């Protein structure tokens, strides 16, 4: 998700489809795409 | 012209040429396009003074 968001969306998504590689929610960018509390600041599970 | 309001000028040298019409670039060109009477007058006037002019309207 983060790599597709940054650059080379076609190449990144094609490689991800070939590899059948899944994305885990962990990350900042890829957690603002889905619209979730970022894993930083006060959004950490400790503070949640 | 001579009827302009009063304004006191500090110019120390005299320009022998006054600024031409500030819209000649458009009106003259479009007169050449339509080739109307103003453009013909301009053409004959330029020919009398031996200038370079477009003799064929747009």
């Amino acid at each position: 998700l983060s790599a597709a968001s940054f650059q080379e969306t076609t190449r990144v998504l094609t490689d991800a489809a070939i590899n059948a590689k899944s994305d885990s929610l962990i990350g900042l960018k890829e957690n603002v795409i889905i619209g979730k509390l970022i894993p930083a600041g006060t959004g950490l599970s400790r503070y949640r | 012209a001579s009827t302009a309001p009063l304004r006191i000028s500090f110019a120390k040298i005299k320009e022998p040429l006054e600024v031409p019409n500030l819209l000649a670039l458009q009106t003259e060109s479009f007169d050449w396009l339509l080739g109307n009477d103003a453009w013909k007058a301009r053409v004959e006037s330029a020919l009398e003074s031996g200038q370079d002019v477009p003799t064929k309207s747009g």
Binding site: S2, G27, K29, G41, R46 | -
Partner: protein, 722 residues
């Protein structure tokens, strides 16, 4: 200018629109309406009770102000909203550097957090009172500036050229001093002996000259007397009572030091109060400073005439010797550029000499309010040589300041550089934006997840180098490099612990260690951090923005990217003129920063010796070459080099494992290959800081180290079948 640091005045219609649903709820609850739809109708009608209810409701609802280009976290800040008339948003005068917002038609956007958590975070984390220190270097950003500093400088300046009155008199208090000032028989800046009562803390410098007496005088907490000036006695009433007295011109840099000390020593509320008091005093005394630009206050030095005439005569001689045919046109040019550079610098120094220090422009420049000395040179003495078309240097300069009046051709020549600079800025905005985007995408998700990894490794940073004449002096860049970085382990030089382990490395430790003679220090760092979960707080150090220890969950990567991206627009490093040079001139400025950060091979690449050896030249007319054969029974190596190489290593000489051969920019790949990993880290950090601190921009080395750590996280594998 009447706002507190945590206050914003927002227009009436804007506040009405943003807070609509709350206004309807309050109107219904206060029985001003029987139903929500009627409340909506009346709110649309703009009744008076609606306005009173808006005043009631905006309280205790923090409001996030923002400017369009958000170059760092102090570009969106939370304020407490107060309801104001007009059609414009009222903002504090000294938060204009955090936003970069000058009042020339700039605009501000504004947002309203809704949830309890959202506004709680707004007030606790984002409030303008808390955000006083920049994250890039730790220097305070919300501090007085421009007219405010010109006012405190007038307050605490000397009496030179200020025709003092009542100098040498003695006063039993400052109240008596202001009585004399009102009477017209004392000046705010006249040397006078003032008595200060119990509670006043004397100057740190003046204490050892305490009053002689058999009894032990409580210099900390006793009445004392000081040969001060009235303005300084007034200035020291703005600072908190416990603060030591200040007895010097607080122009711009000393005010920055005082604000930094206040922030690092006193709690945030008192620091904000002190900032407000300093703001009020600075404005108040800036009004009466007497700084008013007039055509006479721009003083053209009488030196300029004769200097420019004599150098003009020399130019005439050079032109005559060109037209006679002895020299070429290029020689004539270079000679005239040298002549007129001499003339320009001579006129600049004469202009600096001429004006008094009580001049308006001199006051605002020397106070560090607004201005430089080149600007004054152009305005008063001389404009000088300018970038000709196609990035060249006009031989003939502009021999006239703006006060004297540029000629026609002088103005036509001068507009070249203006246009070029405007276009350069327009492009560099987007260039820096792209650079910051890449830095953020790389460094994002490097988050402090660990309180403390139990490492004992660190960097061997020079603590007090520069032993020029055998004198231990604090290094010139401890502020960026070694400051804020904690200590790996206890440092002992005399058999006792000078600095305990893992403690914040502030200036007091620096003075201790430089006095005791050390020349290095072992600091914990992210580069040497070994933690299971990403980075740890202790190795990173202290957050340059909050001052305290880095809190777990800090998005340090985004902070580092923003810190490196902020000054990107203002670098402005590129060749003024072509100078008939290519290749030798490596890329300068933001191009250089992208070159280092992308790992792209430098444009002016120069090979670096693989091993210590004997190096000689095997130059061939078809192709020049430099060949080094190493000792210790090693294989020889060679480098193809251009004819124009300006070699910095002689033939048949002894090179070492990690030395350059020709003048240029070493590849980071080489420094990683032949030297090692600490070497490439050091080289990259130093090379980026080179341009950054050549401009004067100051970024802590941690923010670069984050990117460098991300750049070296992967290894290319070989012999991998097993």
């Amino acid at each position: 200018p009447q706002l507190k640091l945590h206050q914003c005045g927002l227009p009436k219609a804007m506040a009405l629109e943003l807070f609509k649903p709350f206004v309807m709820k309050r109107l219904v609850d206060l029985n001003h309406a029987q139903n929500i739809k009627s409340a909506k109708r009346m709110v649309e009608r703009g009744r008076t009770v609606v306005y009173d209810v808006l005043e009631e409701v905006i309280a205790e609802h923090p409001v996030l102000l923002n400017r369009a280009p958000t170059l760092h976290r102090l570009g969106i800040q939370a304020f407490e909203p107060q309801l104001v008339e007009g059609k414009a948003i009222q903002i504090h005068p000294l938060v204009c550097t955090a936003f970069n917002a000058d009042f020339d038609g700039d605009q501000m956007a504004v947002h309203l957090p809704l949830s309890a958590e959202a506004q709680a975070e707004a007030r606790i984390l984002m409030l303008s009172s808390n955000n006083i220190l920049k994250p890039a270097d730790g220097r305070p950003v919300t501090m007085p500036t421009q007219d405010m500093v010109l006012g405190l400088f007038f307050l605490t300046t000397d009496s030179e050229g200020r025709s003092p009155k009542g100098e040498g008199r003695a006063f039993g208090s400052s109240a008596e001093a202001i009585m004399a000032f009102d009477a017209g028989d004392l000046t705010l800046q006249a040397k006078i002996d003032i008595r200060f009562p119990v509670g006043t803390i004397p100057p740190r410098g003046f204490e050892p000259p305490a009053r002689e007496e058999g009894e032990p005088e409580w210099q900390q907490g006793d009445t004392f007397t000081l040969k001060t000036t009235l303005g300084r006695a007034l200035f020291n009433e703005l600072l908190p009572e416990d603060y030591p007295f200040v007895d010097y011109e607080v122009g711009k840099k000393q005010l920055s030091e005082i604000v930094n000390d206040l922030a690092e020593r006193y709690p945030k509320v008192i620091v904000a109060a002190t900032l407000d008091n300093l703001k009020a005093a600075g404005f108040f005394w800036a009004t009466r400073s007497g700084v008013t630009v007039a055509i006479s206050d721009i003083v053209v030095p009488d030196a300029k005439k004769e200097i420019v005439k004599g150098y003009e005569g020399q130019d005439e001689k050079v032109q005559k010797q060109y037209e006679r045919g002895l020299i070429t046109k290029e020689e004539r040019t270079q000679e005239l550029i040298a002549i007129w550079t001499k003339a320009t610098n001579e006129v600049a120094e004469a202009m600096n000499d001429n004006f008094p220090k009580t001049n308006p422009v001199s006051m605002m420049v020397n106070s560090g309010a607004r201005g430089n000395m080149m600007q004054m040179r152009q305005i008063a003495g001389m404009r000088g040589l300018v970038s000709n078309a196609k990035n060249e240097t006009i031989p003939r300069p502009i021999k006239a300041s703006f006060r004297e009046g540029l000629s026609v051709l002088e103005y036509f020549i001068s507009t070249h550089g203006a246009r070029k600079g405007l276009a350069d800025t327009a492009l560099r905005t987007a260039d820096s934006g792209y650079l910051t985007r890449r830095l953020v995408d790389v460094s994002q998700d490097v988050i402090i997840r660990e309180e403390d990894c139990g490492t004992e490794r660190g960097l061997k940073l020079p603590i007090a180098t520069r032993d020029a004449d055998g004198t231990l002096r604090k290094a010139e860049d401890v502020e960026t490099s070694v400051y804020a970085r904690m200590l790996a382990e206890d440092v002992v030089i005399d058999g006792k612990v000078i600095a305990p382990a893992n403690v914040d490395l502030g200036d007091v430790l620096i003075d201790a260690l430089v006095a005791h003679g050390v020349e290095e220090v072992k600091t914990r760092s992210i580069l040497t951090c070994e933690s299971q979960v990403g980075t740890c707080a202790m190795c990173y150090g202290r957050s340059l923005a909050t001052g305290k220890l880095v809190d777990i969950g800090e998005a340090v990567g985004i902070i580092a990217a923003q810190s490196i991206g902020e000054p990107g627009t203002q670098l402005t490093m590129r060749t003024f003129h072509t100078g008939g040079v290519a290749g030798d001139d490596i890329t300068q400025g933001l191009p250089r920063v992208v070159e280092l950060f992308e790992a792209r091979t430098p444009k002016g690449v120069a090979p670096i010796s693989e091993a210590s050896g004997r190096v000689r030249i095997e130059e061939t007319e078809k192709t020049k070459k430099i060949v080094v054969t190493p000792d210790d029974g090693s294989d020889e190596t060679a480098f193809p080099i251009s004819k124009r190489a300006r070699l910095l290593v002689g033939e048949g000489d002894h090179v070492e494992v990690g030395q350059k051969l020709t003048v240029g920019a070493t590849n980071p790949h080489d420094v990683l290959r032949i030297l090692g990993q600490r070497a490439v880290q050091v080289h990259l950090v130093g090379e980026v800081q080179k341009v950054y601190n050549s401009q004067g921009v100051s970024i802590h080395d941690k923010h670069i180290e984050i990117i460098i750590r991300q750049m070296l996280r992967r290894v290319t594998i070989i012999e991998s079948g097993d």
